[PDB]
């Protein structure tokens, strides 16, 4: 006879993200084949790992950092490492990951010195953990995690920003995210004063990228910000 079924309390409820199919209406359709198209994106972490340009206030922002010839004990640029920060809005790290809720991995800033060929000098690349006050002095930059980038064979340096966090994942749209302030600070410092040859232009430009590490992982898709369309 009839199978006696007791329907549950969520009967006749259309839930949006129900992980199950529905009734096919117009089945038995042979779709045309798509074997000819190359480069199928199986996973959107194939595009967080592609290095895309950052932005810098000096709606006309600048992907590079000008390098003034004045030697000084303060950072040449120092932006905080937060994926809601407006130096990451138009990357592919901070634009994919802003539409999610949690991340875990290593942001990988790829540098590119776009100055002349016979430039010689060193740069210091200090990532700081989130402290109560932003590090400015080069002495305050040596004590953090650093790596010295020379303009030698390395006209392109990929400084892997570490993942140091009291939780397994981080809130990806949050200014604070943690204890008191701003989640860290990358800071490109100039270490020795830069020898630019004459009849070659002074004030070179260093071009910054922002990719993601191989262990970069995301979680919990949220409804995105639809304010790209206005």
């Amino acid at each position: 006879g009839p199978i006696p079924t007791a329907p549950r309390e969520n009967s006749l409820m259309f839930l949006s993200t129900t992980p199950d199919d529905t009734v096919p209406a117009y089945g038995n359709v042979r779709t045309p084949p798509v074997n000819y198209l190359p480069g199928e994106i199986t996973d959107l972490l194939q595009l967080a790992r592609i290095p895309t340009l950052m932005a810098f206030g000096r709606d006309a922002y600048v992907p590079y950092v000008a390098v003034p010839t004045q030697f000084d004990d303060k950072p040449l640029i120092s932006f905080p490492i937060t994926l809601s920060d407006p130096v990451y809005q138009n990357t592919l790290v901070g634009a994919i990951s802003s539409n999610f809720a949690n991340y875990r991995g290593c942001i990988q800033i790829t540098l590119t010195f776009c100055g002349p060929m016979m430039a010689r000098g060193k740069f210091l690349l200090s990532y700081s953990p989130p402290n109560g006050t932003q590090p400015q002095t080069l002495s305050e930059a040596m004590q953090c995690t650093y790596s010295i980038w020379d303009i030698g064979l390395n006209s392109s340096w990929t400084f892997v920003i570490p993942y140091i966090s009291p939780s397994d994942y981080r809130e990806t749209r949050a200014i604070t995210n943690s204890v008191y302030s701003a989640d860290g600070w990358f800071s490109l410092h100039k270490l020795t004063k830069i020898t630019l040859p004459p009849d070659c232009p002074q004030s070179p430009c260093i071009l910054f990228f922002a990719s993601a590490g191989e262990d970069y992982t995301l979680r919990l898709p949220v409804d995105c910000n639809p304010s790209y369309v206005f």
Partner: protein
């Protein structure tokens, strides 16, 4: 040579949307096609790009890009299916600084006047470098539909053929730096919504030369480097033989 999405973009089967034999070749397939492109100066701002549509350049002859017997084969076949291979040269000396972004953008309308139909050859000489305004970032210049007097014309605020100018390095790209290289080498395969698109009206790729760092050189030093390019189709498959396009 920056191959795109595969190990070998020369490998290409014939299209599955035809019943006839494809014209797999023509009278000179192992030669390049060199065309001029506008020179890069100091007054070029950041992100001022310059697009070369493929195969929109073989028809309009953008910068003297004479297609020889490839344009005269493209005009005599209906469906065309090739993978491109560009090579942009620019004589960056030691005395220059700056960095071009040579990419092969899939499926964009960057040769289109943010205010009309398609660009001419004189208007590509007047402006010399297309400034990345709010329209090209928001896609607000891909051509709006003539709705007619009945429908009230909506305020077009966005269009999906934009350029996000900070994300152009996702494409097959090589950065033409001042102190690593002087020329790029990009090789892309065929893409498209169909296994083969049309010939006169396809824009499956677009050569795109974007200024990331503005050119700076000392006065009296080497001035204003020229930009050339060399487009060459890899394994085309011409279908639908007919007479010359009218």
């Amino acid at each position: 040579v920056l191959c795109a999405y595969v190990e070998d973009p020369t490998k290409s089967d014939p299209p599955s949307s035809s019943t006839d034999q494809p014209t797999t070749t023509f009278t000179a397939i192992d030669r390049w096609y060199t065309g001029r492109l506008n020179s890069w100066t100091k007054a070029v701002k950041t992100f001022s790009f310059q697009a070369v549509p493929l195969p929109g350049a073989f028809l309009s002859r953008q910068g003297g890009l004479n297609g020889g017997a490839f344009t005269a084969t493209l005009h005599r076949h209906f469906l065309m299916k090739c993978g491109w291979q560009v090579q942009v040269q620019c004589n960056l000396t030691q005395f220059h600084q700056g960095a071009l972004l040579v990419a092969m953008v899939p499926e964009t309308t960057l040769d289109v006047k943010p205010d009309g139909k398609a660009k001419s050859l004189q208007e590509l000489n007047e402006e010399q470098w297309v400034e990345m305004s709010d329209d090209y970032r928001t896609g607000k210049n891909m051509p709006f539909q003539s709705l007619g007097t009945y429908y009230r014309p909506p305020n077009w605020t966005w269009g999906p053929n934009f350029i996000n100018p900070y994300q152009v390095t996702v494409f097959p790209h090589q950065i033409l730096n001042a102190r690593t290289s002087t020329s790029v080498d990009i090789n892309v395969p065929y893409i498209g919504e169909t296994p083969t698109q049309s010939s006169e009206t396809q824009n499956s790729w677009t050569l795109l030369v974007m200024v990331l760092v503005p050119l700076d050189y000392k006065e009296g030093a080497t001035t204003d480097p020229e930009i050339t390019f060399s487009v060459r189709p890899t394994s085309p498959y011409f279908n639908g033989l007919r007479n010359r396009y009218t």
